[PDB]
């Protein structure tokens, strides 16, 4: 029951209740760089709580070494210890990951867990 390892319902809680006290366990589905200019690179993530995916996660730049040294990568399972929500002028919300711990490496997990569907914001 691999989905029992993920905080099912955390994405809805973040995006509907603005709950930032939870420390949810999520799976990275994908990571890619965001287009940037003359600045530190920035990374965006598609994350899963087992029920939903959400593509609006951004890594704080202080966490860039986790991506660049390949510890945070697609399929890994991580616990979010500190995050903030930012709401854009157009109404869409971005979740900025400030502190996280990788609980299980991508190589130890190996696959997308469950069948999460995109969150309807």
């Amino acid at each position: 029951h691999m989905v029992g390892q993920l905080s099912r319902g955390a994405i809805a809680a973040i995006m509907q209740k603005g709950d930032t006290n939870i420390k949810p366990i999520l799976q990275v589905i994908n990571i890619r760089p965001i287009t940037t200019g003359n600045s530190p690179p920035r990374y965006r993530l598609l994350m899963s709580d087992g029920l939903n995916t959400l593509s609006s996660f951004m890594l704080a730049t202080q966490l860039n070494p986790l991506v660049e040294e390949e510890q945070l990568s697609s399929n890994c399972v991580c616990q979010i210890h500190r995050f903030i929500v930012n709401t854009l002028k157009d109404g869409r919300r971005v979740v900025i990951l400030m502190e996280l711990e990788v609980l299980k490496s991508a190589e130890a997990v190996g696959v997308k867990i469950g069948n999460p569907v995109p969150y309807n914001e």
Partner: peptide
């Protein structure tokens, strides 16, 4: 879904 040019603003 949010484009790169808007996600960082």
């Amino acid at each position: 879904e949010i484009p790169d040019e808007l996600i960082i603003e």
